[PDB]
Short mmCIF file of all heavy atoms in Angstrom, two decimals:
data_model
loop_
_atom_site.label_atom_id
_atom_site.label_comp_id
_atom_site.label_asym_id
_atom_site.label_seq_id
_atom_site.Cartn_x
_atom_site.Cartn_y
_atom_site.Cartn_z
N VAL C 187 -1.31 36.59 -30.61
CA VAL C 187 -0.79 35.85 -29.47
C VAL C 187 -1.55 36.30 -28.26
O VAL C 187 -2.09 35.41 -27.48
CB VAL C 187 0.64 35.94 -29.24
CG1 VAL C 187 0.96 35.68 -27.82
CG2 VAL C 187 1.58 35.16 -30.19
N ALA C 188 -1.59 37.56 -27.89
CA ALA C 188 -2.26 38.09 -26.82
C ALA C 188 -3.79 37.67 -26.85
O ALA C 188 -4.35 37.32 -25.77
CB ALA C 188 -2.24 39.64 -26.79
N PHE C 189 -4.39 37.75 -28.00
CA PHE C 189 -5.75 37.34 -28.27
C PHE C 189 -5.98 35.83 -27.98
O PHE C 189 -6.94 35.45 -27.25
CB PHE C 189 -6.02 37.58 -29.85
CG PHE C 189 -7.43 37.52 -30.37
CD1 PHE C 189 -8.41 38.47 -30.07
CD2 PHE C 189 -7.79 36.30 -31.03
CE1 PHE C 189 -9.59 38.23 -30.51
CE2 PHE C 189 -9.05 36.20 -31.44
CZ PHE C 189 -10.03 37.08 -31.15
N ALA C 190 -5.10 34.99 -28.52
CA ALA C 190 -5.10 33.56 -28.18
C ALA C 190 -4.94 33.26 -26.72
O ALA C 190 -5.59 32.45 -26.13
CB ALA C 190 -4.04 32.94 -28.98
N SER C 191 -3.99 33.95 -26.02
CA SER C 191 -3.74 33.77 -24.62
C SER C 191 -4.91 34.02 -23.82
O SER C 191 -5.10 33.39 -22.81
CB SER C 191 -2.49 34.54 -24.22
OG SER C 191 -2.31 34.59 -22.88
N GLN C 192 -5.52 35.22 -24.08
CA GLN C 192 -6.65 35.73 -23.33
C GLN C 192 -7.92 34.73 -23.59
O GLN C 192 -8.61 34.46 -22.56
CB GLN C 192 -7.01 37.13 -23.87
CG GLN C 192 -8.19 37.69 -23.13
CD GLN C 192 -7.80 38.00 -21.69
OE1 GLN C 192 -6.83 38.48 -21.35
NE2 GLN C 192 -8.54 37.51 -20.86
N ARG C 193 -7.95 34.10 -24.79
CA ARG C 193 -9.04 33.24 -25.03
C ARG C 193 -8.73 31.85 -24.30
O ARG C 193 -9.67 31.24 -23.75
CB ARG C 193 -9.06 32.83 -26.63
CG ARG C 193 -9.61 34.03 -27.43
CD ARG C 193 -9.18 33.88 -28.83
NE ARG C 193 -9.62 32.56 -29.57
CZ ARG C 193 -10.83 32.46 -30.21
NH1 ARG C 193 -11.69 33.57 -30.30
NH2 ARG C 193 -11.18 31.28 -30.76
N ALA C 194 -7.45 31.41 -24.14
CA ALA C 194 -7.15 30.20 -23.48
C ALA C 194 -7.42 30.45 -21.98
O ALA C 194 -8.07 29.53 -21.40
CB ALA C 194 -5.70 29.91 -23.69
N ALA C 195 -7.05 31.52 -21.50
CA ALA C 195 -7.28 31.94 -20.03
C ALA C 195 -8.79 31.89 -19.75
O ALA C 195 -9.17 31.52 -18.78
CB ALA C 195 -6.62 33.16 -19.65
N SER C 196 -9.53 32.44 -20.72
CA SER C 196 -11.03 32.25 -20.63
C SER C 196 -11.53 30.81 -20.63
O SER C 196 -12.49 30.50 -19.77
CB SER C 196 -11.66 33.03 -21.70
OG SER C 196 -11.22 34.39 -21.80
N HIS C 197 -10.99 29.87 -21.40
CA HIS C 197 -11.43 28.58 -21.34
C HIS C 197 -11.14 27.87 -20.05
O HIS C 197 -11.99 27.02 -19.51
CB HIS C 197 -10.79 27.82 -22.55
CG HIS C 197 -11.08 26.26 -22.62
ND1 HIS C 197 -10.26 25.35 -21.95
CD2 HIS C 197 -12.13 25.54 -23.08
CE1 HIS C 197 -10.78 24.18 -22.12
NE2 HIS C 197 -11.90 24.31 -22.90
N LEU C 198 -9.95 28.13 -19.61
CA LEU C 198 -9.57 27.66 -18.30
C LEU C 198 -10.53 28.03 -17.17
O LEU C 198 -10.94 27.31 -16.27
CB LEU C 198 -8.16 27.96 -17.90
CG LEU C 198 -6.97 27.40 -18.76
CD1 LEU C 198 -5.73 28.21 -18.54
CD2 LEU C 198 -6.79 25.95 -18.36
N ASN C 199 -10.81 29.38 -17.15
CA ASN C 199 -11.74 29.85 -16.18
C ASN C 199 -13.11 29.10 -16.23
O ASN C 199 -13.72 28.67 -15.23
CB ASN C 199 -11.86 31.30 -16.38
CG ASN C 199 -10.64 32.13 -15.97
OD1 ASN C 199 -10.46 33.29 -16.30
ND2 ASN C 199 -9.84 31.57 -15.05
N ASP C 200 -13.68 29.05 -17.42
CA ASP C 200 -14.85 28.14 -17.58
C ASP C 200 -14.85 26.71 -17.01
O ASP C 200 -15.77 26.43 -16.21
CB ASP C 200 -15.20 28.12 -19.14
CG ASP C 200 -16.10 29.26 -19.58
OD1 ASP C 200 -15.93 30.42 -19.08
OD2 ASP C 200 -16.87 29.06 -20.57
N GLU C 201 -13.81 26.04 -17.26
CA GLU C 201 -13.72 24.69 -16.66
C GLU C 201 -13.70 24.71 -15.15
O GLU C 201 -14.36 23.92 -14.52
CB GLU C 201 -12.39 23.92 -17.09
CG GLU C 201 -12.29 23.51 -18.54
CD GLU C 201 -13.37 22.41 -18.85
OE1 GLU C 201 -14.58 22.71 -19.10
OE2 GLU C 201 -13.02 21.21 -18.91
N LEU C 202 -13.04 25.73 -14.64
CA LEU C 202 -12.94 25.82 -13.18
C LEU C 202 -14.25 26.12 -12.62
O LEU C 202 -14.82 25.37 -11.85
CB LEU C 202 -11.93 26.97 -12.84
CG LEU C 202 -11.64 27.20 -11.33
CD1 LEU C 202 -11.01 26.00 -10.76
CD2 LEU C 202 -10.76 28.43 -11.28
N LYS C 203 -14.91 27.20 -12.97
CA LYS C 203 -16.21 27.60 -12.66
C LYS C 203 -17.14 26.46 -12.56
O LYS C 203 -17.92 26.25 -11.49
CB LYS C 203 -16.71 28.71 -13.66
CG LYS C 203 -18.00 29.31 -13.50
CD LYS C 203 -17.99 30.67 -14.28
CE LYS C 203 -19.11 31.67 -13.92
NZ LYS C 203 -19.21 32.75 -15.02
N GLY C 204 -17.20 25.67 -13.56
CA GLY C 204 -18.15 24.48 -13.73
C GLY C 204 -17.78 23.30 -12.69
O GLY C 204 -18.69 22.79 -12.13
N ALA C 205 -16.58 22.98 -12.68
CA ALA C 205 -16.13 21.93 -11.70
C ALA C 205 -16.39 22.34 -10.24
O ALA C 205 -16.89 21.48 -9.44
CB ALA C 205 -14.66 21.64 -11.82
N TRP C 206 -16.29 23.69 -9.98
CA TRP C 206 -16.55 24.20 -8.68
C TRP C 206 -17.96 23.96 -8.34
O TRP C 206 -18.40 23.62 -7.24
CB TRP C 206 -16.14 25.65 -8.54
CG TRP C 206 -16.36 26.38 -7.11
CD1 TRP C 206 -17.58 26.59 -6.56
CD2 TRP C 206 -15.42 26.88 -6.25
NE1 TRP C 206 -17.44 27.23 -5.39
CE2 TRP C 206 -16.14 27.52 -5.19
CE3 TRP C 206 -14.00 27.20 -6.47
CZ2 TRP C 206 -15.39 28.28 -4.14
CZ3 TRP C 206 -13.34 27.87 -5.40
CH2 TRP C 206 -14.08 28.35 -4.20
N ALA C 207 -18.84 24.47 -9.26
CA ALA C 207 -20.27 24.24 -8.93
C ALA C 207 -20.66 22.79 -8.75
O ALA C 207 -21.33 22.42 -7.72
CB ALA C 207 -21.04 24.93 -10.13
N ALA C 208 -20.24 21.86 -9.67
CA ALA C 208 -20.47 20.49 -9.46
C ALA C 208 -20.07 19.99 -8.13
O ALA C 208 -20.65 19.09 -7.51
CB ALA C 208 -19.75 19.70 -10.58
N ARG C 209 -18.97 20.59 -7.63
CA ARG C 209 -18.44 20.21 -6.31
C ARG C 209 -19.30 20.83 -5.16
O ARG C 209 -19.49 20.15 -4.06
CB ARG C 209 -17.02 20.68 -6.15
CG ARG C 209 -16.23 20.22 -4.98
CD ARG C 209 -16.08 18.61 -5.09
NE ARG C 209 -16.43 17.99 -3.78
CZ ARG C 209 -15.97 16.78 -3.30
NH1 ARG C 209 -15.10 16.24 -4.01
NH2 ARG C 209 -16.31 16.30 -2.18
N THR C 210 -19.84 21.98 -5.39
CA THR C 210 -20.61 22.53 -4.31
C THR C 210 -21.85 21.86 -4.09
O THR C 210 -22.08 21.32 -2.90
CB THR C 210 -21.06 24.01 -4.56
OG1 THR C 210 -19.84 24.78 -4.71
CG2 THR C 210 -21.71 24.57 -3.46
N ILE C 211 -22.58 21.64 -5.11
CA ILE C 211 -23.81 20.62 -4.92
C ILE C 211 -23.38 19.17 -4.49
O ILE C 211 -24.10 18.57 -3.64
CB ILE C 211 -24.80 20.63 -6.12
CG1 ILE C 211 -25.64 21.89 -6.11
CG2 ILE C 211 -25.54 19.29 -6.32
CD1 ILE C 211 -26.35 22.45 -7.23
N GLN C 212 -22.28 18.55 -5.12
CA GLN C 212 -22.03 17.23 -4.51
C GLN C 212 -21.80 17.30 -3.00
O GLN C 212 -22.40 16.35 -2.33
CB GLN C 212 -20.56 16.78 -5.11
CG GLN C 212 -20.00 15.58 -4.48
CD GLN C 212 -18.57 15.34 -4.87
OE1 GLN C 212 -17.89 14.53 -4.14
NE2 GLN C 212 -18.11 16.11 -5.81
N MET C 213 -21.01 18.19 -2.48
CA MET C 213 -20.88 18.25 -1.07
C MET C 213 -22.17 18.66 -0.28
O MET C 213 -22.40 18.34 0.84
CB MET C 213 -19.56 18.79 -0.62
CG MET C 213 -19.34 18.80 0.86
SD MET C 213 -17.60 19.17 1.25
CE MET C 213 -16.89 19.95 -0.29
N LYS C 214 -22.94 19.46 -0.98
CA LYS C 214 -24.21 20.00 -0.45
C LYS C 214 -25.16 18.59 -0.25
O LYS C 214 -25.84 18.49 0.81
CB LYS C 214 -25.02 20.96 -1.38
CG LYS C 214 -24.47 22.39 -1.27
CD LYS C 214 -25.38 23.30 -1.89
CE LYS C 214 -25.08 24.78 -1.66
NZ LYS C 214 -25.65 25.75 -2.61
N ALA C 215 -25.07 17.79 -1.30
CA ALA C 215 -25.86 16.56 -1.20
C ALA C 215 -25.35 15.70 -0.15
O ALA C 215 -26.06 14.96 0.72
CB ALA C 215 -25.70 15.81 -2.59
N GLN C 216 -24.01 15.63 0.02
CA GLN C 216 -23.27 14.97 1.10
C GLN C 216 -23.65 15.31 2.40
O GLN C 216 -24.09 14.58 3.37
CB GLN C 216 -21.64 15.17 0.79
CG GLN C 216 -20.73 14.29 1.34
CD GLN C 216 -19.29 14.80 1.18
OE1 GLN C 216 -18.99 15.30 0.07
NE2 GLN C 216 -18.38 14.72 2.14
N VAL C 217 -23.79 16.64 2.63
CA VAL C 217 -24.21 17.28 3.89
C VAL C 217 -25.63 17.02 4.20
O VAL C 217 -26.05 16.58 5.33
CB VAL C 217 -23.97 18.71 3.93
CG1 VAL C 217 -24.70 19.38 5.03
CG2 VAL C 217 -22.53 19.12 4.10
N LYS C 218 -26.56 17.16 3.19
CA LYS C 218 -27.92 16.83 3.34
C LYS C 218 -28.21 15.37 3.83
O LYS C 218 -28.89 15.18 4.94
CB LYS C 218 -28.67 16.95 1.95
CG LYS C 218 -30.14 16.64 2.04
CD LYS C 218 -31.09 17.66 1.52
CE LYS C 218 -31.82 18.29 2.62
NZ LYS C 218 -32.20 19.74 2.14
N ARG C 219 -27.52 14.50 3.07
CA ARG C 219 -27.67 13.09 3.45
C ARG C 219 -27.17 12.94 4.93
O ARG C 219 -27.74 12.18 5.70
CB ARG C 219 -26.77 12.24 2.52
CG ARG C 219 -27.43 11.76 1.26
CD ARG C 219 -26.59 10.86 0.58
NE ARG C 219 -25.24 11.34 0.14
CZ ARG C 219 -24.96 11.97 -1.00
NH1 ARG C 219 -26.13 12.23 -1.75
NH2 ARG C 219 -23.83 12.45 -1.15
N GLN C 220 -26.03 13.66 5.30
CA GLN C 220 -25.53 13.51 6.65
C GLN C 220 -26.57 13.87 7.71
O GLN C 220 -26.65 13.37 8.82
CB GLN C 220 -24.25 14.47 6.77
CG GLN C 220 -22.96 13.73 6.22
CD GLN C 220 -21.85 14.57 6.24
OE1 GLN C 220 -20.77 14.35 6.93
NE2 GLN C 220 -21.80 15.73 5.39
N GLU C 221 -27.39 14.84 7.32
CA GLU C 221 -28.46 15.40 8.15
C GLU C 221 -29.64 14.42 8.31
O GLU C 221 -30.35 14.38 9.34
CB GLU C 221 -28.98 16.75 7.59
CG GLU C 221 -28.12 17.87 8.21
CD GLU C 221 -28.33 19.09 7.20
OE1 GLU C 221 -29.20 19.30 6.50
OE2 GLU C 221 -27.21 19.85 7.12
N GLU C 222 -29.90 13.64 7.24
CA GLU C 222 -31.06 12.50 7.26
C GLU C 222 -30.48 11.40 7.96
O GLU C 222 -31.36 10.85 8.75
CB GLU C 222 -31.32 12.16 5.88
CG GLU C 222 -32.15 13.06 4.98
CD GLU C 222 -33.14 13.71 5.80
OE1 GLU C 222 -34.18 12.93 6.18
OE2 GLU C 222 -33.03 14.89 6.36
N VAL C 223 -29.26 11.07 8.02
CA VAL C 223 -28.69 10.04 8.84
C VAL C 223 -28.88 10.62 10.29
O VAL C 223 -29.38 9.82 11.19
CB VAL C 223 -27.22 9.79 8.52
CG1 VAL C 223 -26.80 8.53 9.08
CG2 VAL C 223 -27.13 9.39 7.12
N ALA C 224 -28.47 11.80 10.60
CA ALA C 224 -28.64 12.31 12.01
C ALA C 224 -29.98 12.39 12.50
O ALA C 224 -30.19 12.14 13.74
CB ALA C 224 -28.13 13.75 11.99
N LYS C 225 -30.93 12.58 11.64
CA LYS C 225 -32.35 12.50 12.16
C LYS C 225 -32.94 11.19 12.33
O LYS C 225 -33.77 11.01 13.28
CB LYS C 225 -33.32 13.26 11.19
CG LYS C 225 -34.62 13.62 11.86
CD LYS C 225 -35.69 13.94 10.92
CE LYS C 225 -37.15 13.70 11.52
NZ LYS C 225 -38.18 14.08 10.68
#
Side-chain angles (χ1 to χ4, degrees):
Chain C
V187 161
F189 189 79
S191 174
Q192 182 65 53
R193 284 160 63 91
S196 305
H197 171 267
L198 292 164
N199 291 158
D200 272 28
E201 293 292 76
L202 182 60
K203 179 163 197 199
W206 178 296
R209 190 65 226 208
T210 297
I211 288 158
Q212 174 195 160
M213 184 167 21
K214 279 195 169 160
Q216 200 188 316
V217 164
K218 176 129 257 156
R219 274 192 298 277
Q220 274 175 119
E221 277 159 26
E222 286 318 286
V223 198
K225 197 199 155 177

